[PDB]
Amino acid sequence: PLESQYQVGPLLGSGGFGSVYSGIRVSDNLPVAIKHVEKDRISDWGELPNGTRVPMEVVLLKKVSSGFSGVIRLLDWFERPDSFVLILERPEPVQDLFDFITERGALQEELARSFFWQVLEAVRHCHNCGVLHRDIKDENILIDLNRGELKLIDFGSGALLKDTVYTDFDGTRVYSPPEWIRYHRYHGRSAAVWSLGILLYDMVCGDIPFEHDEEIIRGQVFFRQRVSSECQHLIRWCLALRPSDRPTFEEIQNHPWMQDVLLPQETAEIHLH
Numbered sequence: 001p002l003e004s005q006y007q008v009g010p011l012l013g014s015g016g017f018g019s020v021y022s023g024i025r026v027s028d029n030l031p032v033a034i035k036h037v038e039k040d041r042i043s044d045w046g047e048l049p050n051g052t053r054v055p056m057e058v059v060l061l062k063k064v065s066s067g068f069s070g071v072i073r074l075l076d077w078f079e080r081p082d083s084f085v086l087i088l089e090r091p092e093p094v095q096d097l098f099d100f101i102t103e104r105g106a107l108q109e110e111l112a113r114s115f116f117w118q119v120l121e122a123v124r125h126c127h128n129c130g131v132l133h134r135d136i137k138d139e140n141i142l143i144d145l146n147r148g149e150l151k152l153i154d155f156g157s158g159a160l161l162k163d164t165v166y167t168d169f170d171g172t173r174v175y176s177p178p179e180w181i182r183y184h185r186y187h188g189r190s191a192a193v194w195s196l197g198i199l200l201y202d203m204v205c206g207d208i209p210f211e212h213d214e215e216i217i218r219g220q221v222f223f224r225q226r227v228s229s230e231c232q233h234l235i236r237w238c239l240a241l242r243p244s245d246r247p248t249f250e251e252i253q254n255h256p257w258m259q260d261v262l263l264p265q266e267t268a269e270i271h272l273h
């Protein structure tokens, strides 16, 4: 019934996450994204309420797709003999944040503030749902250009949130914290905060701060672009070398740089129309 219920469109991209296509749900013409992954390329498995064997991505997406949030929701899934197929929300028009920043350069702080806030709200949501994303970055954030609303994608390197140590990582290296680089050990939240510092820098500078492992471990941040003392301070805080010197989500959201955020719609009127 998968081919009956969805009309397939153009390929949107492919990579470690599989292949993703543009789609339309024939029911009510809902725009969707159709993502295929081959079974032998799945290392991470978990189980359902009814308890069948599924990719962990499905377990994690189910856990975060209840109610509204800043997460692209899993609408349905299908097993095939050699692959799983996931039906996801698709905003229209949409652009990922990597492309947006490539095209438009470093973001004005008012815009970075709005965007970064919405990311923080989405990541808190995942955390509340018992999900750790583990690959927060520009390419995993979609922008609904009409509503000014950001949406997290790609739970393929994620895990159940826990309070004990993680000793595996298959997210993006240049967003990975120094403790991972040095010990192959991190805890969830504070590694997430590090990734968020990288993202914020990326937003306001138009590129990431560190390329090589030794820069990550050195942790010295240099600004190529004019950025306010308050934004610089938040970034250097998120990027504390010691995980315990990093702020909590609450402390990030109470930081003075974070005050007076624009709502999504205003953000789109000002910056996106």
Ligand SMILES: CCN(CC)CCCCCN1c2ccccc2Oc2ccc(Cl)cc21
Binding pocket: 012, 013, 014, 017, 020, 032, 033, 035, 072, 088, 089, 090, 091, 094, 096, 098, 139, 142, 153, 154, 155
């Ligand atoms: C690197 C950005 N872009 C170049 C053209 C490649 C597209 C990667 C994003 C595809 N994606 C996507 C990638 C990886 C996991 C889930 C995903 O869910 C989506 C849902 C809706 C849309 Cl519109 C897109 C996705």
